[PDB]
Design a protein around this ligand. Structure first.
Ligand code: MG
Ligand code: MG
Ligand code: MG
Ligand code: MG
Ligand code: MG
Ligand code: MG
Ligand code: MG
Ligand code: MG
Ligand code: MG
Ligand code: MG
Ligand code: MG
Ligand code: MG
Ligand code: MG
Ligand code: MG
Ligand code: MG
Lengths: 230, 121, 68, 56, 247
RNA sequence: UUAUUCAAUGAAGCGGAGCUGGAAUUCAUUUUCCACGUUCUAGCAUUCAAGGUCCCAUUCGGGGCUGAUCCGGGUUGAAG
RNA sequence: CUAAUUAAAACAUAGCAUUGCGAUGGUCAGAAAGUGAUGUUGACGCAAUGUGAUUUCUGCCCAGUGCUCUGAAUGUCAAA
RNA sequence: CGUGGGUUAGUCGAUCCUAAGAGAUGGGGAAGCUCCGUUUCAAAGGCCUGAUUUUAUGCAGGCCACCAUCGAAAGGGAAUC
């Protein structure tokens, strides 16, 4: 096309004004966006003592898929099925009158931090799921030591949001199974086998290993320049 | 993980939805009436001999008006009270703190007839 | 319950656990305002014994004042 | 006076050239010469630079 | 028992800078990618006079790299800089008078002015009229450079700090005598209220530590410690030797 | 270096890794380093960039990619 | 310049000289401060003083007291 | 002294602009009355769409990086003889 021509621009220094490049690296973020990024940085800069970052070894994606597959079968009552089952328990008063036992034993997961800590202490829990992301971590940071001492298998899992999903909350921070249905006993057992393989059996070694000290990209890539030049 | 291309280093506040008010009760429940109607604008004629010299000679109706009335509210009130048309309004605040309006009518009307039609001279 | 463990561990201020947690948190509180709303108590157990309950009406403000 | 220029028409405010009411017909003519003599210099400085790096 | 004139100056009431007629802050161009990896070309459009300053100001106009607009920086004019002159600022720039280059990328014995004490603070050294900076050394590992300041002192500045080649224009100004209190009056009219000066020995003891007595005499030693405070630092502060320089 | 301290900016190009050519006498290995689109002149430089490429559902117009290397989201330099 | 008893030889002055300071600074503010003046500054500058245009000179003194010194390191040396 | 009359503006001023300055906000200090600061270390925002039938003109593009306000009846300023 003889009408159309090729300009090409000289985007060098001191010539031909710069184009609209991406400066997402260079945004002055709002003050909260800096502090929520630099807090995560400052955690992994310092030497994290092993009582923290005995977290961040998390039940991985394939075996946390199995864990939530089992725990979703034992989901607690909603308000929808509770208001229904009280009406059938109303009919227990109306005509049932066993004593008050129109309803069977409910098999549900056990949640709530005070409840679950008390369930571990009486050694009634069969498996505990611990959220890694809770804040303040002081709420949960004693839980692996307690679970190790009472002999309850525990998993540090990702998501207090996800633990809240199976208990119909928004956040749960713990989720325990204290008894399963008899058809799911082998399902729990192979989970218990791998979860102690990842968490409880390493616990005596994880207790010694500090965390953090991870340097940033520039200062890491300047550290190996000093190593190669010396 | 992709991310949005940000051509500006400046982060501005986003444009959130600003809902309108939808109140559960009225603020005052009875609107005030017209705080300056025609009877509040025009109070009385000014009936000095100097104001009477302007009735025939100049075709000006001299009034005493509210201090809160501007030259639009004087013109509007004079028109629909006295069924005239105003050519011009000149207004002064008198040294007794009252507002005096020189209201000149258009040539179709005669301020001498209208002065008798109001009732003064 | 869990608040008994929270109560005793909070007494171990110079423990290696809390000395890290105090270091990370004291940095975060300087990058906020001098007076600013806390979303929830950093010490829920200390909030119970002083009077706080988790219901609508209870408000936490974190605040720093100059020593000396 | 500077607000009177909004009352008069465009003929009083501009000469019929490029850069009419801005520059002064000698600064414009010098601007046209200085424009022209540099791309002809730039074309020459391009073929001088390209040839001398094509050698070695 | 009354606060002295040297103490009252810090309140900054009538003792401020008379800064209405001044042309701006005479700084360097802000250190950016143009001046850190290549150069940028300016143009002098005015050599103007700065009120209260004995050195002319060069208004140098650059193009903004990122937006289509013109940015007018205000330089202190170097002796030899003219109007219509292209001015180069950057690292790859050429040594001419009025060009702005880092101290590392100019050789030994180069004469520079408007020299940054820290890289990017837009000019701090050699800014009064006639003064200059000589580069007397280099330490290329851990990049530094040794200079001679206009006082005669030796300073070590980063090699990424900048400077403008040449002396600051307007030199030889103080070599002219003022001849009269009037020409002192209008020099300090456009600077600040420090003129005239009443001698402290010409005072009452309430006003100055030197005043009073039946004869105008100092009374105590005029040399005072650095370890004194306001109201006692009226004289020679922390002097090493006094009087003439005759050994 | 992450607390702290100094400073600068519309937080715009930082760090690392990638094309060449050699007085690397390639030592069949970047033990290795260097230069990154602009300097006769008081001009001009803006419309997501023309070009190229591919798609649309083509609507006379619209969207990507490349032009303009990739990755790390550490704004950058000090001081500790 | 002593309004309203002192207009002077007193104050100022240019000239001269001394002193401190290269900015993390000198001199000074402020109760503090993410605080100020000089400072829209940078030694031909700023600040602190002394003498007071020009001619011609500024002798002797470091024992005293002040000021100052990368100066001597079991004389004295508080708290921890 | 007693009683009244009298001051009419699009064009004259105020109003608007900034000056030296004063002074909120964000934020820091201070037991506090309040102090500092006036662009700061803030997520600080309105401007036109080319031009209208799915338009109370947006539920869209697109543009803009500054950041209160007060401060002159002698300064600047639309226009009457
Ligand atoms: Mg941090
Ligand atoms: Mg009036
Ligand atoms: Mg009037
Ligand atoms: Mg004097
Ligand atoms: Mg006296
Ligand atoms: Mg920047
Ligand atoms: Mg007298
Ligand atoms: Mg100031
Ligand atoms: Mg002598
Ligand atoms: Mg002791
Ligand atoms: Mg009278
Ligand atoms: Mg007028
Ligand atoms: Mg205004
Ligand atoms: Mg105003
Ligand atoms: Mg004027």
């Amino acid at each position: 096309n003889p009408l159309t021509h090729s300009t090409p621009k000289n985007f060098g220094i001191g010539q031909a004004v710069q184009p609209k490049r991406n400066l997402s690296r260079y945004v002055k973020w709002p003050e909260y966006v800096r502090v929520q990024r630099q807090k995560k940085i400052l955690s992994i800069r310092l030497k994290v003592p092993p009582t923290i970052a005995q977290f961040q070894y998390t039940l991985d994606r394939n075996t946390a898929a199995e864990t939530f597959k089992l725990f979703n079968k034992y989901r607690p009552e909603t308000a929808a099925e509770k208001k229904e089952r009280l009406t059938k328990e109303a009919a227990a008063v109306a005509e049932g009158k066993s004593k008050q036992d129109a309803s069977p034993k409910p098999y549900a997961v056990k949640y709530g931090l005070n409840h679950v800590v008390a369930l571990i202490e009486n050694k009634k829990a069969k498996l505990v799921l611990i959220a890694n992301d809770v804040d303040p971590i002081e709420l949960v940071v004693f839980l692996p030591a307690l679970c190790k001492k009472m002999g309850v298998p525990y998993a540090i899992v990702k998501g207090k949001a996800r633990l809240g999903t199976l208990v119909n909350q928004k956040t749960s921070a713990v989720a325990a199974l204290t008894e399963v249905r008899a058809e799911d006993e082998a399902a729990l057992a192979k989970l218990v086998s791998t979860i102690d393989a990842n968490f409880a059996d390493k616990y005596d070694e994880v207790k010694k290993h500090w965390g953090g000290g991870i340097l940033g990209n520039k200062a890491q890539a300047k550290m190996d320049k000093r190593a190669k030049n010396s | 993980k992709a991310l949005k291309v940000r051509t500006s280093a400046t982060f501005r506040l986003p444009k959130t939805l600003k809902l309108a008010r939808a109140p559960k009760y009225a603020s005052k429940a009875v609107p005030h009436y017209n705080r300056l109607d025609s009877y509040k604008v025009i109070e009385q004629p000014i009936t000095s001999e100097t104001a009477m010299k302007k009735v025939e000679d100049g075709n000006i109706l001299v009034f005493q008006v509210s201090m809160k009335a501007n030259k639009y509210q004087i013109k509007k009130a004079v028109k629909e009270l006295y069924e005239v048309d105003v050519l011009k309004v000149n207004t002064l605040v008198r040294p007794n703190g009252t507002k005096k309006a020189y209201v000149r009518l258009t040539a179709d009307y005669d301020a001498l007839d209208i002065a008798n039609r109001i009732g003064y001279i | 319950g869990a608040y008994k463990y929270l109560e005793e561990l909070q007494r171990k201020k110079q423990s290696d656990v809390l000395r890290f947690l105090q270091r990370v948190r004291v940095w975060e509180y300087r990058q906020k305002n001098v007076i600013h709303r806390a979303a929830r108590p950093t010490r829920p157990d200390k909030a119970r014994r002083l009077g706080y309950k988790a219901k609508q009406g209870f408000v936490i403000y974190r605040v720093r004042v100059r020593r000396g | 006076r500077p607000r009177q220029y909004a009352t008069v028409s465009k003929t009083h405010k501009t000469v019929s050239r490029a850069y009419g009411g801005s520059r002064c017909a000698n600064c414009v003519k010098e601007r046209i010469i200085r424009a022209f003599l540099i791309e002809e210099q730039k074309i020459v400085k391009k073929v001088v630079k390209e040839q001398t790096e094509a050698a070695k | 028992g009354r606060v002295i004139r040297n103490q009252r100056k810090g309140a900054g009431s009538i003792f401020t800078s008379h800064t209405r007629l001044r042309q701006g802050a005479a700084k360097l161009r802000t250190l950016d990618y143009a001046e850190r990896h290549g150069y940028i070309r300016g143009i002098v459009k005015q050599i103007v006079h700065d009120s209260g300053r004995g050195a002319p100001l060069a208004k140098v106009v650059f193009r903004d790299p990122y937006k289509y607009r013109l940015r007018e920086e205000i330089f202190i004019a170097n002796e030899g800089v003219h109007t219509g002159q292209f001015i180069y600022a950057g690292k790859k720039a050429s040594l001419n008078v009025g060009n702005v280059l880092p101290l590392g990328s100019v050789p030994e014995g180069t004469i520079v002015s408007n020299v940054e004490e820290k890289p990017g603070d837009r000019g701090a050294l050699a800014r009064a009229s006639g003064n200059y900076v000589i580069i007397i050394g280099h330490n290329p590992d851990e990049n530094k450079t040794r200079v001679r300041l206009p006082s005669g002192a030796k300073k070590v500045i980063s090699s990424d700090a900048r400077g403008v080649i040449g002396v600051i224009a307007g030199g030889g100004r103080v070599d002219k005598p003022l001849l009269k209190a009037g020409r002192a009056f209008h020099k300090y009219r456009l600077k600040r209220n420090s003129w005239p000066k009443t001698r402290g020995v010409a005072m009452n003891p309430v006003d100055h530590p030197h005043g009073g007595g039946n004869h105008q005499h100092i009374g105590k030693a005029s040399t005072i410690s650095r370890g004194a405070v306001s109201g006692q630092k009226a004289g020679l502060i922390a002097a090493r030797r006094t009087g003439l320089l005759r050994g």
